Every structure is written in C-alpha cells, then in structure tokens.
Amino acid sequence: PINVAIFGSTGSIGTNALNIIRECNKIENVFNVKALYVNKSVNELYEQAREFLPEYLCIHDKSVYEELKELVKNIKDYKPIILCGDEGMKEICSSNSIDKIVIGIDSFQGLYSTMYAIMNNKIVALANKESIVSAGFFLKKLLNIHKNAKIIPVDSEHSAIFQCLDNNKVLKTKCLQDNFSKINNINKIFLCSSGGPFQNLTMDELKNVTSENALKHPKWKMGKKITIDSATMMNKGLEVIETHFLFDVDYNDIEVIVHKECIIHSCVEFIDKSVISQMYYPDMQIPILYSLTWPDRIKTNLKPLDLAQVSTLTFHKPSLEHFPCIKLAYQAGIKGNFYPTVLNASNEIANNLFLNNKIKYFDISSIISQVLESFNSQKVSENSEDLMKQILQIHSWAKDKATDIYNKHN
Amino acid sequence: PINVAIFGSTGSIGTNALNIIRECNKIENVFNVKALYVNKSVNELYEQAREFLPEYLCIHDKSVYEELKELVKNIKDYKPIILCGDEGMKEICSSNSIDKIVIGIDSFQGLYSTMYAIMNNKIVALANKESIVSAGFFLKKLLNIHKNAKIIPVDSEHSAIFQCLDNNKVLKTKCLQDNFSKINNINKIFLCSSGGPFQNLTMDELKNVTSENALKHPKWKMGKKITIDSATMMNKGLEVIETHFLFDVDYNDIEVIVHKECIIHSCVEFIDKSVISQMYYPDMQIPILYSLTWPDRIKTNLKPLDLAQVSTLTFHKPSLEHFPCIKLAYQAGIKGNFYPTVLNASNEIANNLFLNNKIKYFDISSIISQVLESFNSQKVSENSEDLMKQILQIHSWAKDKATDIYNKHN
Numbered sequence: 001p002i003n004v005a006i007f008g009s010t011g012s013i014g015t016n017a018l019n020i021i022r023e024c025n026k027i028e029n030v031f032n033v034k035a036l037y038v039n040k041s042v043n044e045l046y047e048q049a050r051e052f053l054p055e056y057l058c059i060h061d062k063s064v065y066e067e068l069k070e071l072v073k074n075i076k077d078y079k080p081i082i083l084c085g086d087e088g089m090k091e092i093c094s095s096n097s098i099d100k101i102v103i104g105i106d107s108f109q110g111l112y113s114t115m116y117a118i119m120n121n122k123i124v125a126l127a128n129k130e131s132i133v134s135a136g137f138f139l140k141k142l143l144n145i146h147k148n149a150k151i152i153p154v155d156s157e158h159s160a161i162f163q164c165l166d167n168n169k170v171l172k173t174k175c176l177q178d179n180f181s182k183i184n185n186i187n188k189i190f191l192c193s194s195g196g197p198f199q200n201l202t203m204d205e206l207k208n209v210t211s212e213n214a215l216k217h218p219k220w221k222m223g224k225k226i227t228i229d230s231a232t233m234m235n236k237g238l239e240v241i242e243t244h245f246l247f248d249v250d251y252n253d254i255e256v257i258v259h260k261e262c263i264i265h266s267c268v269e270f271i272d273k274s275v276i277s278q279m280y281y282p283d284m285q286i287p288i289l290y291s292l293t294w295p296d297r298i299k300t301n302l303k304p305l306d307l308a309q310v311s312t313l314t315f316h317k318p319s320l321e322h323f324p325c326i327k328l329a330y331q332a333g334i335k336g337n338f339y340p341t342v343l344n345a346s347n348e349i350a351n352n353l354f355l356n357n358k359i360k361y362f363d364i365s366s367i368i369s370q371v372l373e374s375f376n377s378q379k380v381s382e383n384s385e386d387l388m389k390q391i392l393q394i395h396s397w398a399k400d401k402a403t404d405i406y407n408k409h410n
Numbered sequence: 411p412i413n414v415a416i417f418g419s420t421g422s423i424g425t426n427a428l429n430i431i432r433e434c435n436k437i438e439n440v441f442n443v444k445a446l447y448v449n450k451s452v453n454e455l456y457e458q459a460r461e462f463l464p465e466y467l468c469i470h471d472k473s474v475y476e477e478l479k480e481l482v483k484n485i486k487d488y489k490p491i492i493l494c495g496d497e498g499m500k501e502i503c504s505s506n507s508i509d510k511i512v513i514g515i516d517s518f519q520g521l522y523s524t525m526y527a528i529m530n531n532k533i534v535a536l537a538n539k540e541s542i543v544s545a546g547f548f549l550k551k552l553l554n555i556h557k558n559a560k561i562i563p564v565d566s567e568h569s570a571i572f573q574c575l576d577n578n579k580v581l582k583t584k585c586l587q588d589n590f591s592k593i594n595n596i597n598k599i600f601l602c603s604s605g606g607p608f609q610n611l612t613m614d615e616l617k618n619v620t621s622e623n624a625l626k627h628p629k630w631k632m633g634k635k636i637t638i639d640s641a642t643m644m645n646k647g648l649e650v651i652e653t654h655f656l657f658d659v660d661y662n663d664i665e666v667i668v669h670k671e672c673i674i675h676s677c678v679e680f681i682d683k684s685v686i687s688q689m690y691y692p693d694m695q696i697p698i699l700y701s702l703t704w705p706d707r708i709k710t711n712l713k714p715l716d717l718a719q720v721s722t723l724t725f726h727k728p729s730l731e732h733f734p735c736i737k738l739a740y741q742a743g744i745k746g747n748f749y750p751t752v753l754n755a756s757n758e759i760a761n762n763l764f765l766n767n768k769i770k771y772f773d774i775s776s777i778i779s780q781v782l783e784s785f786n787s788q789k790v791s792e793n794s795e796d797l798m799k800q801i802l803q804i805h806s807w808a809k810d811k812a813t814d815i816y817n818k819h820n
C-alpha cells in the first residue's frame with residue numbers, strides 16, 4: 001500500500017493526482033491518501049476528504065480552519081487530524097505513515113514544503129519547476145544531507161526523460177545528484193515543446209500580440225502564468241535549467257525541439273547513440289502516476305495511444321529571434337551561480353506585466369535581459385540555511401529590479 | 411573485458427558485429443573476440459583472424475582445415491586453437507573463457523549452435539528469427555533447464571522492444587520465459603514495419619508485381635529472402651510470432667504499424683498506458699552492440715540522430731487484404747502448436763518460388779494458406795530430443811507439402 005500526501009490538492013496537479021489515484025484504486029487497492037493540504041478552498045477540501053478520508057487535513061488559511069472542522073463532522077466514522085498553516089505542513093512531512101508527497105504548490109509554499117519533505121527523507125513528486133530553477137544548488141545540498149530523500153520529476157518532459165532511463169542504473173543514484181548522467185549513460189536530451197500559441201507568427205505579428213491572444217482558445221487547459229510562459233517559450237527555457245539540475249546534463253547536451261502534436265514528451269540519447277522516448281496523449285495523469293509508482297508501474301484504464309490515428313509526428317528547431325527567452329535561459333544556466341534565480345524572478349514580474357497588458361511581447365525578454373545584465377555573481381554560501389537566505393534575497397532583489405525597470409520606461 | 415564468439419563471422423550480422431566491436435574498442439578496450447566460426451570462407455576468416463587474433467578459430471568445412479593452418483602461420487605472435495566441424499563449435503561453446511555468442515547463421519546450423527550455446531549457459535545474441543518461429547517451444551524448454559543461459563534478441567524491432575524495458579525488471583526473468591510480460595509490466599507492443607515497396611499499390615497492381623519489383627529496392631543492404639519477406643510483409647508476420655515467444659505477449663496485444671521512415675524501431679505500451687520507444691537511423695550496429703553490452707551501454711562514434719532534420723515520422727495500419735501474409739502469421743501464431751513451424755517452412759518455399767518468377771504475389775499467401783490448412787496439430791513431445799526431431803519432421807513435411815501444391819498447379 002502506497003501512502004501519499006497531496007500538497008495543493010485542489011490545484012491542477014492535485015486534482016489530477018486524486019483522479020488517477022481514484023481510477024487506479026478501482027482496479028486494485030494500491031494507494032492510501034493519508035493527507036490533503038490546501039490554501040483556502042475549504043468546501044472542495046471537504047468534498048475530497050469525504051471521498052478519500054485522509055488521516056490528516058491541513059488548511060493554510062487560518063480563517064477557514066473552524067469552517068473545515070465543522071464541515072468534517074458531517075462525514076461518518078471519521079476522526080482526522082485537522083491542522084493549519086506551515087506548522088501543519090511540517091507535521092504531515094514528519095509523519096511515519098507517509099512515504100510520498102506530491103508537491104502541487106507554486107514557488108512560495110512550494111519550495112518551502114519541498115524542503116520539509118526532503119528533511120524528512122520522503123520521496124517528493126515535484127511538479128514545481130520554478131523551485132528547481134531558483135533553488136537547484138540548495139536542493140542538491142539538502143539531498144546530499146538527507147540521503148534517503150528523493151525528488152521524482154512530475155513535469156511532463158522530465159517525467160518522460162526519467163521514464164526513458166534504466167531503473168537498474170537510476171536506483172544507484174538519484175535526481176539532483178552529481179554524476180547522474182554518467183551513471184545512467186546519458187549523452188544528450190531532446191526536450192520537446194508544444195511551441196505555444198505564437199509558434200507560427202511573423203516578427204511583425206509578434207510585436208503586437210497580447211495576453212488575450214495567448215489565452216484565447218487554449219488547446220490544453222492550464223494556468224495563466226504557464227500559458228504565458230508557453231507563449232514566450234520561457235517555459236521551455238526554465239525546463240532546460242530544470243533538466244540540467246535534475247539529470248546533471250550539460251547545457252550543450254540539451255536541445256529544445258518543437259513537437260506540436262505533444263505525443264512524444266521528450267527523448268534521451270545514450271552514449272551508444274540509441275535514443276529512447278516516452279509517448280502518450282497530453283495528459284498529466286501519467287507523469288503524476290509514475291512519480292508515485294516508481295520504480296514500478298501499475299494498471300490504469302487510460303485510453304491506449306492510437307498511433308495510426310495520430311498518424312504524423314513533427315519536429316523543428318525553434319527560432320531564437322522569435323523566442324529570445326530561450327536564449328536568455330541558456331545564457332543564465334551556462335553562467336550559473338544565481339543567474340537562474342534571477343532569470344526566474346525577473347520572468348515572474350515580466351510575465352505578470354504582459355498578462356495584465358502593461359508591456360508588449362518583446363519587452364518581456366528586454367526586462368529579463370536587463371535584470372540579468374544588472375546582477376553581480378555572489379559567493380555561494382556553504383551553509384544550507386545561509387544558502388536558502390541568499391536565494392530568497394536574490395529572488396526579492398530581482399523582482400524589485402524588474403519592477404523598477406518597468407516603472408522607469410513606464 | 412567482454413569475451414565474445416562470433417558464429418557466422420563473414421555474413422551480414424557477423425561483419426556488422428566485428429565492425430562495431432572494432433569501432434568501440436578504439437574508444438575503450440571492452441571486447442575480446444575469443445572465437446570466430448565460419449562455414450568455408452577461409453580467406454575472409456584469415457583476414458579477420460589477423461585483426462582480432464581470437465584464441466579459437468573454427469571452420470565447418472573439414473576440407474579447408476589444412477589451408478587455414480597454413481594461412482594462420484603467416485600471422486606473427488599467434489598460436490590459436492584451430493578446430494573444425496560441429497565438434498569444434500561445441501568445444502568453443504564449452505570454453506569457460508567465452509561469455510557471449512553472436513549467432514549469425516541461417517537454417518538448422520544456426521539452431522544447432524544456439525542449442526549448444528544454451529547447453530553451456532552462455533549469453534546468445536540471436537539474429538535468426540526463423541529459428542525462434544520454428545523452434546520456440548524447444549528453445550523455451552532448453553532455457554528452463556539451463557537457467558543461466560539467455561537469448562538476447564538482435565532483430566532491430568526486438569532489440570528496440572528489449573531496449574525499452576526496465577533492466578531492474580528484465581534481470582528478474584529472461585527472454586523466452588513464461589510470465590516475461592507480466593514481470594516487465596508490458597501491456598501491448600507496436601511492431602514497426604517499413605511496409606516494403608508495395609504500400610500504395612492497388613490489389614490489381616499487386617496481382618502482377620514480380621521479384622524484380624521487390625528487389626529493385628536501392629535503400630538498405632539486406633539479402634534476397636528477407637527483401638521478398640519485406641515486400642509481402644511476411645517478415646513482420648514472422649516477427650509477430652517472434653515477439654510472442656521472446657516476450658510472452660498475447661497476439662491480440664501485438665500491433666503491426668507501418669512507419670516508412672524507419673526511425674522508430676518499435677514501441678512498448680506498459681500497463682499504465684505509457685509508451686516507450688527506441689529510435690535511431692536504420693543501422694544494425696546498435697541492436698548488435700546492445701546484445702553484447704546488455705545490461706550496460708558503451709560509448710560509440712555513430713552519427714547522432716538529428717530529429718529536426720528527420721522532421722516527420724508517420725504511422726498507418728497495414729491493409730490485411732493487400733498483405734494477407736500478416737493475417738496468416740497471426741492465424742498460425744494464435745492456433746499455436748507447430749503451426750508457426752509450418753508457416754515458416756511453407757514461406758521458405760513460397761518466397762523462393764516468387765524470387766525465381768515461378769509464382770505470383772498472391773500465390774505466396776495462397777500456397778502458405780493451403781499448407782496451414784493441411785496441417786494436423788500434433789501432441790508436443792515431452793522429451794527434448796523427440797521435440798527437436800518433431801520440429802525437423804514437421805519443417806520437412808511443410809516444405810514438401812508446399813512444393814507439391816506448386817507442382818499440381820504448374
């Protein structure tokens with residue numbers, strides 16, 4: 001029986017996690033959902049609690065804590081531990097009845113809960129790429145201290161890469177460990193991208209695109225921030241850095257490829273030049289499920305891939321002139337130090353300004369570029385707590401720098 | 411160092427094996443070629459012996475044994491154990507200084523050497539698909555007895571499938587064993603086919619295709635028999651049965667799919683519905699190398715797959731009306747017993763009659779069908795020696811039956 005906690009159970013990752021857990025448990029009783037954690041969606045948490053009956057419930061927003069305790073009295077034969085805030089999150093992480101933790105929270109509570117999961121030697125199914133990009137060094141350090149903790153990637157491309165690896169080798173190392181690529185015989189990574197909604201626009205059309213155009217008739221259901229990142233290809237830029245940290249693959253050995261059908265999720269070239277790829281319909285249930293079952297697989301009732309119906313798969317190189325965010329991401333990664341923290345932070349501001357119609361498409365990369373040019377590399381702290389504080393300082397600095405640049409050329 | 415014997419070292423598989431061994435050894439000394447075995451190409455064997463300096467040389471033709479003695483005196487600092495015939499093959503198989511044997515021989519002699527390799531608990535890199543189709547029961551029995559012996563597939567599609575599997579699972583079992591698919595969480599196999607030269611042809615056009623049309627195929631270096639089998643899709647038919655035996659996958663769970671670009675070499679759908687595929691340019695060196703390095707991979711200097719240049723991959727269902735050999739292969743496989751032996755034997759005759767312009771395209775399938783219809787299921791011998799004789803008897807009967815059908819019609 002696999003004992004799981006879901007952090008951010010009402011968000012996109014959380015609800016997909018619970019859906020695939022539900023459907024797999026109908027086939028064979030594999031998962032016990034031991035804990036659910038949400039920010040403030042007390043009614044939805046209640047509905048999930050009624051179905052999954054977790055031992056722990058945690059709500060971040062203290063103002064709905066009493067409402068949750070009263071709602072839960074409706075449920076028959078059920079006495080959960082009901083917790084609140086950061087403190088409740090920490091208690092869940094330290095429970096011996098939880099093996100695996102799904103992190104479905106964005107950058108703030110996300111890195112925070114990831115750190116506590118690692119400190120408690122849990123298996124951590126991590127969807128939050130911003131955390132790896134911004135705090136990669138710190139996560140590596142922490143995993144070197146907490147030797148039984150493991151990060152398993154949930155991001156579709158990174159799960160794909162992970163699924164292409166031989167577990168006989170993966171089991172002798174772990175993600176974010178030095179020499180991971182050597183041990184797994186990895187030579188090169190093809191990181192597949194949908195290309196986003198602006199992939200076929202001319203330069204002249206790109207100058208005038210708005211966030212409405214990016215968010216209009218979205219071929220897949222996702223949040224506004226990641227949709228904007230897909231539009232600029234900064235999503236794939238962040239994913240390049242994520243790939244480098246997760247798998248210890250050199251930046252010269254990570255190739256972004258536009259694959260508009262979104263069937264091949266990424267490919268790995270091994271040192272013999274054989275390439276292995278993972279394929280499925282665009283559906284987050286597979287990456288989530290694999291993070292929870294690894295190194296095994298279990299039966300699902302998901303629709304089988306019909307390759308003849310799919311019929312055609314295409315691949316092309318993205319234009320760095322049309323998508324300068326990719327270039328900026330490689331440059332920041334290659335420069336190393338805290339440049340990735342700065343890249344992620346300045347993008348967070350630039351993304352939000354474009355979303356809210358304050359700046360144009362090419363202003364996004366301009367702002368990020370200027371913040372990166374502005375940054376001065378710092379001595380990397382040896383102490384893990386000092387390092388965390390350093391990352392937080394740089395993140396805050398970079399957000400304020402981007403905002404100041406916006407306010408200058410207002 | 412990996413100690414490898416090459417059986418049939420001057421044939422296509424054998425020379426490709428020595429090429430990749432040569433190239434990999436320039437990067438790092440990984441392989442010691444300990445034995446070479448050929449039928450009668452004593453000059454080519456001398457040239458290979460001059461480069462690889464194997465401890466054993468063997469020549470099946472007793473007559474040219476004396477000519478090999480005198481040629482090998484020309485090589486300096488080199489006193490090899492020169493053996494001959496089946497007695498020499500067996501002494502090579504019984505050597506404790508040989509780990510792996512590449513079997514690139516066709517017909518009975520390929521099966522006979524395989525048997526002796528298995529009897530000495532060797533790793534057998536097996537390229538002869540006809541031997542698995544015809545003698546699968548016999549090989550399975552032999553592998554159950556000889557617990558440390560293993561067959562590792564060299565056929566490109568079967569190597570691809572094998573490469574897609576998790577070696578943490580593969581190492582708990584081995585090919586041609588009951589429950590292999592269960593242990594490896596395999597749900598379904600996509601068996602990729604080039605489709606051969608006739609995919610767009612109408613039924614009326616297929617009626618009059620000749621072997622010259624099948625063999626006017628300046629694309630990949632392969633022999634006449636397999637080129638004819640590619641044209642009829644009986645090659646894929648035989649590979650379906652091979653798949654069933656190697657990996658214990660049900661016939662209803664093997665799908666032939668036409669992939670004309672020959673980049674994806676086959677795909678495995680696991681029980682979660684995630685699909686893993688292996689990809690490379692059409693090149694037999696990767697499948698051969700993997701059979702010799704499994705469960706590890708080593709560095710090569712092969713050209714890296716350029717996916718953006720490839721650009722497009724296509725897939726479609728083959729038409730069973732146009733390629734009835736595929737339907738017959740499934741039918742023979744599903745019926746079980748010695749029907750695959752009969753299928754293989756009758757195809758051997760029909761293929762050769764078409765190759766020599768004695769029959770037409772649809773006569774191939776017609777002849778095979780009638781032989782299959784004439785065959786009465788036989789009780790499968792429990793004794794290992796009776797079973798080998800049973801297989802040989804049925805093989806012979808089926809070839810005669812096919813020939814008699816041709817002679818009545820002619």
Ligand SMILES: Cc1cccc(CCC[C@H](CC(=O)N(C)O)CP(=O)(O)O)c1
Pocket residue numbers: 155156157192193194195196220229230231233235236262281282283284
């Ligand atoms: C839900 C789903 C699952 C697999 C693939 C897709 C297509 C969108 C892929 C990207 C979103 C993402 O980063 N995922 C899903 O990890 C969009 P992008 O490739 O950056 O244009 C969507």
Ligand SMILES: Cc1cccc(CCC[C@H](CC(=O)N(C)O)CP(=O)(O)O)c1
Pocket residue numbers: 565566567602603604605606630639640641643645646672691692693694
């Ligand atoms: C040399 C090479 C290597 C990989 C793929 C190919 C394309 C021909 C594939 C088939 C030949 C074969 O059975 N192999 C190679 O195992 C021809 P087919 O798919 O039956 O039409 C050729």
Ligand SMILES: [Mn+2]
Pocket residue numbers: 155156157239
């Ligand atoms: Mn992604």
Ligand SMILES: [Mn+2]
Pocket residue numbers: 565566567649
């Ligand atoms: Mn083949």
